[PDB]
Amino acid sequence: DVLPPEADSSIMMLTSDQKPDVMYADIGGMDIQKQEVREAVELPLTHFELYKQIGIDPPRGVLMYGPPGCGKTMLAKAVAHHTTAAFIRVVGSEFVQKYLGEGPRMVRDVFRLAKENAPAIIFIDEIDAIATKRFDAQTGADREVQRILLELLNQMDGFDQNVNVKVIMATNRADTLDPALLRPGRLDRKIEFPLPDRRQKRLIFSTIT
Amino acid sequence: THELQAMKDKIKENSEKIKVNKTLPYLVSNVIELLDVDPNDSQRKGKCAVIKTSTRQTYFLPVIGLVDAEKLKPGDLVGVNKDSYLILETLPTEYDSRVKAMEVDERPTEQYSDIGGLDKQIQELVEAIVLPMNHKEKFENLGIQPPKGVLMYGPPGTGKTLLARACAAQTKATFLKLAGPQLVQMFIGDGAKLVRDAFALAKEKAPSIIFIDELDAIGT
């Protein structure tokens, strides 16, 4: 007999729903960012009957880059206070372990919770660690985890089209990323976090006061 | 009161069963201090500890049995015999392999009298090493700390290799040969294991003399 299956010993998932994390009142991207996030992030949650009418694919792809400012995880915590959702809080380098056999189970169980149940937004911070491509065999533990990143890169193609999944992603270095990552057909939406400059000063000074 | 001998025979035959527990372990363990008492659910009380292995496994056995938990802070190199999983005695000395003893040296042939013109600058090296030996009792009175690190450099040949080695015969302390490349190994973090390994033998072997050569290379 097999498992239900379940998430096994990987991750471990959930732990976001304990609450609270970060209130969106600080920066929610009112009327500007909440628009692009509306259609391309929280609408894909279900919105099943609307997508068949337009015929345009709302891809899972959400890219973030260029800190400062931070943004990133805060945007994952901002949507957490908008709608109740189970978030995957992980890092690029944390799942590297002494066993590479668990790898095929990880991306399966991480992405199986998006398709079956969809109050789900998966966030991975600083993927440029595993995005580094190392040739040597003694480094195969690193070579296996970027296959893990490429395996979930294949599983996102098994989702489309279409229902259902959402994946948000953030990294501080876009040069080490593999060309297949940002290649069209997988991530079709890239939202560059703008440099705060002068406009966010009075905004961050208003929320601090 | 004559039951002693018949009772003394079974402790030797059980020790004979310890003598077959003497020969022979294929397993060496690392120790972890633990205190565990489980209420049920009449009462079972005691103490247990955690046991590692050299094969990367980590086992579970009650507190030894023989040597008690009074000694010591968690160590390694404790004999565990086959499937019995009982530690009869905790065996020295420290660890590990060739990191333990780098090289055992006795005395140099040459002497400090083979040099000239360095007389004033060689004494600065001769002082710092000789003064803690005899004058340590005089330092405790005046509250003086003896020097430890000393640098010897010059355009080669300066004779520093044999001269600093010839100073080990005058100090009577044991000499241990060491070098910069000697602290380098194939794996990672091995240098941190070697230096902590020598000072562990240094504290046990009483004040001694350890000489290294070309520290600026590894010190770049």
């Binding site: - | 079974k10 049920n40 659910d41 009449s42 079972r44």
Partner: protein, 286 residues
């Protein structure tokens, strides 16, 4: 102290196979041996044991001899093979104990603080779960007697263990197992009335016997005190169920509904799928 004990069929046969020893060679008394117990908790458990030569005269009904040289060295033989196993007391096959058993228990109290004797039965007859368990304490008495040592009955239950069911449960082979859900509960219903109402009739006849003779037992008071706990409802004619009547069928409410509802769907699974599959093969064969 000792609340309940657990007796395995393995140690029980160790009393039975010794009945084949003294049975063929004779002569008097019974099977008596020293019991090896295992205490992991307040509940007592017994795994193995060893039978010792024993004799008890009739005349001289109080004469008994344990063999301590067989009790000492063989313990070390068993202590070497099994460390946790130790002697918890003695045993015998009874069927009925004699007053001399106060000396057998008090002599072995130097080995163990409290020795628990186990009365067993070599030939099962009546009335129920076999053997017996007794614990040795001192309750004195209410009448003013000197301090009295009387073995109190201990509830005994059989139990199993891993690797010991290999040959045991294989040799029988004649039992139908279990079968839970059909004959298992209904057989006991005929037994719980049989065994329940015969000990009832047996005890109420003894309660009437107490009026004629046999007083004391007064008891006292456990006879009527525990009887009145049975008397929370008697039940007497008729059943005094006027409050429990409309509740009675109310317990049959869900049972009958789940019956008729599921059986109708089970019929829909039985009738439909059968006629389909049967009409398939029947008419397409010829």
């Amino acid at each position: 102290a000792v609340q309940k004990v657990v007796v395995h069929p393995l140690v029980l046969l160790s009393v039975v196979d010794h009945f084949n020893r003294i049975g063929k060679v004779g002569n008097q008394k019974r099977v008596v041996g020293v019991l090896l117990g295992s205490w992991q908790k307040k509940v007592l458990d017994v795994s193995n044991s060893f039978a010792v030569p024993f004799d008890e005269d009739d005349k001289d009904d109080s004469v008994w001899f344990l063999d301590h040289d067989y009790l000492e060295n063989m313990y070390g033989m068993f202590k070497k093979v099994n460390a946790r196993e130790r002697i918890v007391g003695w045993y015998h096959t009874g069927p009925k104990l004699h007053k001399n058993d106060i000396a057998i228990n008090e002599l072995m109290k130097r080995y163990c603080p409290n020795s628990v004797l186990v009365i067993i039965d070599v030939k099962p007859k009546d009335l129920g779960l076999p053997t017996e368990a007794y614990i040795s304490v001192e309750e004195v008495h209410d009448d003013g007697t000197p301090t009295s040592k009387t073995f109190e009955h201990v509830t005994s239950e059989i139990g199993a263990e891993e690797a010991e069911e290999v040959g045991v449960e294989h040799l029988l082979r004649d039992i139908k197992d279990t079968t839970v859900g059909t004959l298992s509960q209904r057989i006991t219903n005929q037994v719980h009335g049989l065994k329940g109402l015969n000990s009832k009739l047996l005890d109420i006849r003894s309660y009437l016997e107490k009026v004629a003779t046999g007083k004391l037992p007064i008891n006292h008071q456990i006879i009527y005190q525990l009887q009145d706990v049975f008397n929370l409802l008697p039940d007497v004619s008729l059943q005094e169920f006027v409050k429990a009547f409309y509740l009675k069928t109310n317990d049959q409410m869900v049972v009958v509904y789940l019956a008729s509802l599921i059986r109708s769907v089970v019929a829909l699974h039985n009738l439909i799928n059968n006629k389909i599959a049967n009409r398939d093969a029947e008419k397409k064969e010829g």
